[PDB]
Amino acid sequence: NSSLPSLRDVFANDFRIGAAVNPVTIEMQKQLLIDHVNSITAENHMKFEHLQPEEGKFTFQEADRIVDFACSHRMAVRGHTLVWHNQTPDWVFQDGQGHFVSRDVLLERMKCHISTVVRRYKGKIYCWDVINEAVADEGDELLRPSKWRQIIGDDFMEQAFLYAYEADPDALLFYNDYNECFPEKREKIFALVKSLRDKGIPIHGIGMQAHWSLTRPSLDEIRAAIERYASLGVVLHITELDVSMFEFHDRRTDLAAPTSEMIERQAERYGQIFALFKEYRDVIQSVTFWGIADDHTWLDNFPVHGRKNWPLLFDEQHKPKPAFWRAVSV
Numbered sequence: 001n002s003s004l005p006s007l008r009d010v011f012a013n014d015f016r017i018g019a020a021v022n023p024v025t026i027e028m029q030k031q032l033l034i035d036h037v038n039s040i041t042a043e044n045h046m047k048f049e050h051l052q053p054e055e056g057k058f059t060f061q062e063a064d065r066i067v068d069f070a071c072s073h074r075m076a077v078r079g080h081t082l083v084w085h086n087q088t089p090d091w092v093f094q095d096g097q098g099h100f101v102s103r104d105v106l107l108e109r110m111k112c113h114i115s116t117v118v119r120r121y122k123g124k125i126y127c128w129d130v131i132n133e134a135v136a137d138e139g140d141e142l143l144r145p146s147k148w149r150q151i152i153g154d155d156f157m158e159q160a161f162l163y164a165y166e167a168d169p170d171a172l173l174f175y176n177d178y179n180e181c182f183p184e185k186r187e188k189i190f191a192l193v194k195s196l197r198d199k200g201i202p203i204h205g206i207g208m209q210a211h212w213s214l215t216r217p218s219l220d221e222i223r224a225a226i227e228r229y230a231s232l233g234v235v236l237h238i239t240e241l242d243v244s245m246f247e248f249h250d251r252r253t254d255l256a257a258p259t260s261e262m263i264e265r266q267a268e269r270y271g272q273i274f275a276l277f278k279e280y281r282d283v284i285q286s287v288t289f290w291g292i293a294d295d296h297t298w299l300d301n302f303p304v305h306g307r308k309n310w311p312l313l314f315d316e317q318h319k320p321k322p323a324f325w326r327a328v329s330v
């Protein structure tokens with residue numbers, strides 16, 4: 001690694017380079033992080049269930065540790081995430097009797113959570129994924145069903161962004177989602193964000209999760225999505241990048257190691273992806289990987305539990321993979 005290029009330095013004039021972490025991986029992958037990234041995202045510890053597990057009970061310890069690490073190394077921090085249909089405790093939507101609360105009560109709870117969380121990290125966290133995955137991933141409907149939407153109504157996103165803006169008007173607020181480059185969904189995300197911005201809602205950027213495969217989405221689809229979203233005038237962040245060795249239809253669990261073909265195609269894939277990101281450096285301001293080395297990735301258990309994936313630029317021994325060389329040479 002002595003003579004190895006540093007990711008954040010290579011892309012210094014293009015965009016920040018980030019990694020998703022947790023207290024455990026910060027220790028396990030500390031040197032890689034210190035040598036390559038200038039942005040950090042909490043993989044799980046800033047989600048609702050990990051910040052306010054019970055009403056009035058805030059558990060900022062783990063998030064504080066992540067922020068402390070980032071700040072001690074002059075790394076930016078992306079806040080993830082405030083309002084999402086997943087990883088949110090049941091108490092949030094229920095009353096004493098266990099029945100669903102009213103619109104006003106849920107809005108009060110949403111405002112309280114957002115205000116408390118955002119104000120704590122004001123000045124240390126420069127952006128927040130305010131709304132995560134609200135758009136439907138299947139069907140002809142625009143929005144995915146969720147307790148937030150059911151109880152409050154379809155304007156729940158407008159409210160979330162306004163509450164977050166009030167809490168920290170200097171933060172960049174994002175709508176974050178996956179499968180963001182498939183045409184049908186791209187148009188739903190575009191329509192949603194355009195509608196919000198047309199109402200003056202403080203949504204400053206779109207977060208493209210980029211949980212991609214070797215084949216999907218195509219480079220043309222990625223280019224089209226970047227251009228489509230950029231045309232709204234918002235900032236773009238690639239937020240949870242990883243390149244899975246398995247396509248959606250591939251649920252094999254017996255592969256103990258990736259084939260030389262997988263490794264080679266992944267290298268080509270990462271080179272093509274970063275070449276495209278660099279081309280759009282004027283609108284993309286940050287590229288965060290959902291991890292940093294293959295010794296830790298949520299793809300080991302998703303969508304198939306108990307297997308192994310090799311989605312990042314560094315291997316399990318923290319050594320650069322062929323993908324690393326193609327990525328930094330664009």
Ligand SMILES: O[C@@H]1[C@@H](O)[C@H](O[C@@H]2CO[C@@H](O)[C@H](O)[C@H]2O)OC[C@H]1O
Binds near residue numbers: 044132209240
């Ligand atoms: O440890 C896992 C996390 O890595 C995972 O993170 C999510 C990945 O999918 C994205 O769409 C989400 O935004 C991101 O939070 O969440 C589940 C957890 O078990």
Ligand SMILES: O[C@@H]1[C@@H](O)[C@H](O)OC[C@H]1O
Binds near residue numbers: 178211
């Ligand atoms: O659970 C979600 C999964 O269904 C999607 O494919 O990727 C993002 C995850 O959060």
Ligand code: NA
Binds near residue numbers: 281282
């Ligand atoms: Na840029």
